[PDB]
Design a protein around this ligand. Sequence first.
Ligand SMILES: C=CC(=O)N1CCC[C@@H](n2nc(-c3ccc(Oc4ccccc4)cc3)c3c(N)ncnc32)C1
Length: 271
Amino acid sequence: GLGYGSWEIDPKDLTFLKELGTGQFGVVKYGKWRGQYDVAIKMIKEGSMSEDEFIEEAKVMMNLSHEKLVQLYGVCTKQRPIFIITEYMANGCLLNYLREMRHRFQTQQLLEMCKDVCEAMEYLESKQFLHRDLAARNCLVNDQGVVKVSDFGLSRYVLDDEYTSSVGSKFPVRWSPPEVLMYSKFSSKSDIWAFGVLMWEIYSLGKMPYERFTNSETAEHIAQGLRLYRPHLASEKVYTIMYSCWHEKADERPTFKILLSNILDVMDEES
Ligand SMILES: C=CC(=O)N1CCC[C@@H](n2nc(-c3ccc(Oc4ccccc4)cc3)c3c(N)ncnc32)C1
């Protein structure tokens, strides 16, 4: 209505129902919009984000739409803290979901999680949109067990320097290819590398990549041409797919379209 741009939600239309905890960038709640639509409300703590840049980017993010990508519905920016209003994903963070041994996952379920993420990433790649921090901790799971990609591109607006540079204590070293760790060279191929590490996280039921190493040791391991090795639940064909994401030469890594074709092939062969 009057006073609101197409990317702006009126916070008065929100009903808060449940505290979900603190996610990356701030406190998140479950609620309703206009009494009946389920939403998540992510509250951005003051001083944590480059707010005007994020608001401009939110306009582009609103236009992204894919069934395996968490939908951004709008933002509430007339007050502090600002809110990010998104699709609600009842089963929460993928990393925590993988770590719950009660699920007793079949490998076909794990491969479907990989396919869900790959479809979202093929869509982002088709829009020339980099995720820049793909990992299981940045994927969500809905009430139907569908995994969707979340927090896409958001790292660009984080003000805490410990998260933003390779030399920072909170940088995603374990999901980064050699050219990012050595030279800060981000590209579609650094999202491909990260996707291979995410496939390893899924097939490992949420183990930390390079679980016995520090970040410093991981960077040395990778720079020396060494890699993660095969999770017990991954078949040789699944391992070949994730390993292809880790070629030392970025231009020899597949695209998300190729990875999708490889995953569908294994799904058919392992059906
Ligand atoms: C370890 C506990 C666990 O599960 N957590 C940790 C506590 C909060 C939980 N969480 N987070 C979101 C969410 C909400 C908004 C959002 O903004 C976007 C910004 C840019 C692009 C897309 C989204 C990102 C994630 C979220 C959600 N949507 N639905 C349910 N739980 C959520 C996940």
